[PDB]
Amino acid sequence: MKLNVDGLLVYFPYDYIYPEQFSYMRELKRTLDAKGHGVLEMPSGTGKTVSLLALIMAYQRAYPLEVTKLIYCSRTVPEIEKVIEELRKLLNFYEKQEGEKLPFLGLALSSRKNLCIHPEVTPLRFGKDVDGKCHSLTASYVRAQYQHDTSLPHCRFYEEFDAHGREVPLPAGIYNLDDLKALGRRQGWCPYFLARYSILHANVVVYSYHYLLDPKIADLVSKELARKAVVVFDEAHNIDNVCIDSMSVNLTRRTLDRCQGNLETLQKTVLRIKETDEQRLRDEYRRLVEGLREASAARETDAHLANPVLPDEVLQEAVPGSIRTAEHFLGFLRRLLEYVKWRLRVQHVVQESPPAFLSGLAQRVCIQRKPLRFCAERLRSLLHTLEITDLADFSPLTLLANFATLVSTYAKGFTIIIEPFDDRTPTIANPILHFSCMDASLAIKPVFERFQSVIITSGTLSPLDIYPKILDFHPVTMATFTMTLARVCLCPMIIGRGNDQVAISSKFETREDIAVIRNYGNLLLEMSAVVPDGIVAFFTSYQYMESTVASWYEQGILENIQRNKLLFIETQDGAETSVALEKYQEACENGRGAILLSVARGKVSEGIDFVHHYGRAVIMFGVPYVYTQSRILKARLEYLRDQFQIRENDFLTFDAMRHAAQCVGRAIRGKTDYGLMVFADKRFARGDKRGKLPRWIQEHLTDANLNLTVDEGVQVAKYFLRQMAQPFHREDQLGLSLLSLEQLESEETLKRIEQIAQQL
C-alpha cells in the first residue's frame, strides 16, 4: 500500500494500516525534519517497527544525505532475526512494486560465538573461550608465522576473507545470521570479520545495546559510524540498568587468586622471553616512547582487548617512564593487587567515593592517577608483545587493570561498596567490591553528541519526563500514542481482596503471611478451572515464590491445580528453564492446560514472548518492589535524589510498575489477539501506583474493576472471554480501528488520527 505522509511516499507492505501507525510515522518524520532526538511510546504488537523501517527507507531513498546509514539497537537475538525478516519482507514488497532490485544493503551484527564456523571452536560452550581460541588461530603475528609455516594452528576462514573478501563488497541485500554463516561457508570466509568489514557498505546495521553502549565495545562499531547516521532504541525502558551494569565492576577473592597466579606465570614468561629475545622489550619501549598512535593505528585485527573507555584526549599522552619498563609495571601490578587485597580484608561493608580511594592509594602505594590512566594500554602492549594466545586466563588481570583505570579517571557518579559477606548468607566470607556507576547519561552522552539523531521508544514509558532527566538530554518530541480498539482485547483487573476479604499485598513484611498464600492458591485454582490453557503468574522474588510453592504443596491445594492444568515452574538454570518453557508451550498447543510460575525479574519477562493462545492469562502477584537491602540500589537512590531531586520511593515504585508492565505488555500480538491481565494486590489501588501505568494500558483500566475479589475477577474474566470468544472479522475493524486505502484520504480520518496521539 502506498501512503502519502506530508508529501513523502511510503511503500507500506500490507493492505491495511493502523491510524496510530500513521501518527507514529508522522511524528517520526517531524522528528527527522528537526534532526533531533525524541521519545515516543507505542503499544506492542502494533507494528511500530514496521512503520519505523518504512519511513527510514523512504528517507534513505528520497534523501540519501539526510540518512546516510541506519543504526538499529536491539535486546535479544530472536528480536534481531524478527527485524531482519520484517525488513526482508519490506524489501521484497519494494521489489515487487518497482519491478527492480533496489541497491539496498542490510546487515545484522553479533559476536563470534554467533559468527564462528571453525569446527574446532564450534563445540565450545562459552563465547570468551571462542574469542580466545579465534585470536590464537588469527593473531596478526601468528598469521605472519603461519605464512612461513602452514602446519601452525590457524583459521582458514579468516584467511580467505582477508585474501579475497576485502576487495569485492557483498551485494546489496538483507542477510540473516544463519544466512551470513551460509555465505561464509560458501565463500570460505568468516561472517564475523566479513560483516565488520562490510559495515561501511550496509545501509542498515542492526545489533544489540551492548555492542555500542559499552565503551569497551563502542569503538568496535562507532569507528565506521558517521554523524549523519541515526540510532534506534527499541524497548529500551531498562537501558539505564544496562548502562549501570556495563559500567559496574565486581571483584572477589577467587579473582584475586587467579590474577596472582596469572601474574606470576606472566612474570616467569617475561623472564623466559628476555632470556630468549630481549629485543622485543626494547622495541616495545621504542613504540611507547615514540607514541601509541603508531601501535594503535597499524593493526585493526588485534582489537580483541580494546579499551576505548577513556576520552580520546587521554589516548594521546604516553605512559610515564616510572612504569614503562615491563618489570616496573609488573611490580606496579603486584603492589596494586596487594593493596587491593589488604583493603578488601575488611570485615564490614565500606562505602567510599572514588577520589577518596585514589587518595588513599596514593598515600599508601605511592601511585598517581595520571600513570594509572594508561594502565590498560600498557597492559595491552605487554600482552600483545609476548605472543600470548591463551588470554582467557588473563581475564581477572585485565578486569582489575580496567577497574583501576576507571578509578583513575571516572570518579563522579560512582560508589565503591566493599561487602565481605553475602546479602542472603552473610555467614560465608564473600569479599566483593562494587564500583557502581550512577550516571547512565554519560554512557549515552557521546551518541547524542555525535549522530544526527537518536531514536528511543518502548511500550512501557508511563512517565514521559523521567527519561530526559535520567539520560540528561532534551528529546525534541515527547508524544504517547494512545491505543484505539474497535474490540476491547484487554481486561486489566485489580484484585486486592481475597475470598475471606483478606488484604492482598506483596510487601516483604506481608510476604510470609500464610493467609495470603492460601488466597493466592485459591485464586490460581479458580483461574485454572475457568481461564483457558495459557496461564503465567509472576511473583516478586524467587525465594518468596519457592516458599509459596512449598506451602501450597503442603496445603494440598497444588494437587487440585495440577489436576485442572499442568504446572510448570522455572528455576535458576536457563537450560532447564528453557526445557520447561518448551514443555509449557507444547502442552498449550496440545490442548492440555499449562501453568507457568516465574518471577518478574526472571528470564521470562526479559525475552519470552507469548502468542495469543500463550498469553491468555497473566497474573502479577503484588507490586514487584526490589529488595531494598542492596546498597547499590541505596547508593543509586541517594545519588539521584542528590543530583535530580528524585524521591527514592518514587523510583522504586516506577521500577516495579515498569517491570510489571513489561511482564504484561507481551500478551498481545495485535487487534485479533486478546489477553487477560490480573494484578493481585490492593496496593495498585494507590493513585500514584495506579497512575504510573502506560497510557494505552491504564486507559482500559476501568475504575469499577479496581480492587475486586476472586469471585468478581473470575466472573468478569468469564464475561470478557465469552465476549472476546465471539468470532470477529477484519471488515468490522474498517473505519473504527483499521483503515483502508480510501479511508486514509478522508480528512476527518486525518483529524481523528491527530486527536488519537498527544504530545506532552
Binding site: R563, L566, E576, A580, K583
Partner: protein, 309 residues
C-alpha cells in the same frame, strides 16, 4: 476354538443360528465365520489414595487401570515390579513399600528443589506418554411437477365457458340465504346409511386375532427363521452388484445355502403349520422373498449369458 466357542455362549440365538447353519450341513463353519469377521491424566497419583475404611481397613483395591497408568507414567515402577515381584518381594509388599517410600511421600531449600524437580519430571513423563460449489438450476418446472405424474388436467371448450362463467356470475349475483333447502330427511337418512357401520363408507371392521392363531413357540421360531433368511439375503445382495467372478461363486454358494436352509428348517416348520393346519400364510412371505432372490439371480445369469452371446 475356545475363543469361537465363547462367542456362541454369549449369544444363544447365534449358537442356535450356528447350529441351524453348520451342524445341519447347510453351510460350513468357514463361511459362517467369514461373515462374522485410553487417555492419560496427571491425577493418576493425586486422585488415587489409600482407602481407609471405618475401622482400620486398608482397602487398596489394586485395579489394573491405576497400575497400568502408573507403569505408563513411571517406567521405574514397572522396572521395580518386574525385577522384584514376586521373587524379591510380593506385589502387595511392593505396593506397601511404594506407599511408605519417600518417593511417594515427597513431603528446606533441598525439599523445594526436590519437589520442583519431581513435578518437572512428572510433567515430562506425562507429555512423553501422551505421544505413544455455486449451483444454478436449469429446469425449475421439474419442481412444480415433481414426483407427481401427469394429471388429467382436462380443459374446457371455447369461450362458451365464459358464458357459463357469466351464468354463475348472474346466478349468485342475486342470492338469498336458504335453510330448509339445505338438507332433507331423506338426504340425512342416506348420509347416515353411508356412515352406518358396515356401510359403504364404513369399510371393513373388526379383524381376526392372528396372535392366537400363531403359537408363541411358532412365533419365536418364525422370528429366528426370519433372522436367518435376512442374514443369508444380506450376504447374497452384498455381493451384488456383480463385477468380479468371485462374486458369482459366492452368490452360487449363498443360493445353495438358501436351498439347504429351506429343505432343512423351512419345510418341517411348514409341515408344523400344516400338521396344525394354520390358515395364516406366514411362510408365504418367506417363500416370496426366496423366489424373488432366485428370480434376481437367474435374471442376472441370463443377462451375463446374453453379454457372453
Amino acid at each position: 476354538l475356545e475363543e469361537k466357542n465363547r462367542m456362541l455362549q454369549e449369544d444363544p440365538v447365534l449358537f442356535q443360528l450356528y447350529k441351524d447353519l453348520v451342524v445341519s450341513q447347510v453351510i460350513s463353519a468357514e463361511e459362517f465365520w467369514a461373515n462374522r469377521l485410553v487417555g492419560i491424566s496427571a491425577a493418576f497419583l493425586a486422585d488415587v489414595r489409600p482407602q481407609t475404611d471405618g475401622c482400620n481397613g486398608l482397602r487398596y483395591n489394586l485395579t489394573s487401570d491405576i497400575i497400568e497408568s502408573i507403569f505408563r507414567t513411571y517406567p521405574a515402577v514397572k522396572m521395580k515390579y518386574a525385577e522384584n515381584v514376586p521373587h524379591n518381594m510380593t506385589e502387595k509388599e511392593f505396593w506397601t513399600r511404594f506407599f511408605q517410600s519417600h518417593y511417594f511421600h515427597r513431603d528446606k531449600e533441598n525439599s523445594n528443589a526436590a519437589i520442583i524437580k519431581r513435578f518437572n519430571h512428572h510433567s515430562a513423563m506425562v507429555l512423553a506418554a501422551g505421544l505413544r460449489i455455486a449451483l444454478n438450476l436449469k429446469k425449475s418446472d421439474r419442481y412444480y411437477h415433481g414426483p407427481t405424474p401427469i394429471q388429467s388436467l382436462q380443459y374446457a371448450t371455447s369461450q362458451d365457458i365464459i358464458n357459463s362463467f357469466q351464468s354463475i356470475r348472474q346466478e349468485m349475483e342475486a342470492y338469498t340465504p336458504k335453510l330448509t333447502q339445505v338438507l332433507s330427511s331423506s338426504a340425512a337418512s342416506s348420509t347416515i346409511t353411508a356412515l352406518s357401520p358396515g356401510g359403504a363408507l364404513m369399510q371393513g371392521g373388526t379383524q381376526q386375532a392372528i396372535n392366537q392363531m400363531v403359537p408363541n413357540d411358532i412365533q419365536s421360531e418364525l422370528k429366528h427363521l426370519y433372522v436367518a433368511v435376512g442374514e443369508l439375503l444380506r450376504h447374497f445382495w452384498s455381493c451384488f452388484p456383480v463385477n468380479t467372478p468371485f462374486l458369482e461363486e459366492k452368490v452360487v454358494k449363498m443360493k445353495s445355502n438358501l436351498e439347504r436352509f429351506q429343505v432343512t428348517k423351512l419345510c418341517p416348520f411348514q409341515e408344523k403349520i400344516r400338521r396344525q393346519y394354520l390358515s395364516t400364510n406366514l411362510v408365504s412371505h418367506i417363500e416370496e422373498m426366496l423366489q424373488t432372490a432366485y428370480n434376481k439371480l437367474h435374471t442376472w445369469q441370463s443377462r451375463r449369458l446374453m453379454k457372453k452371446t
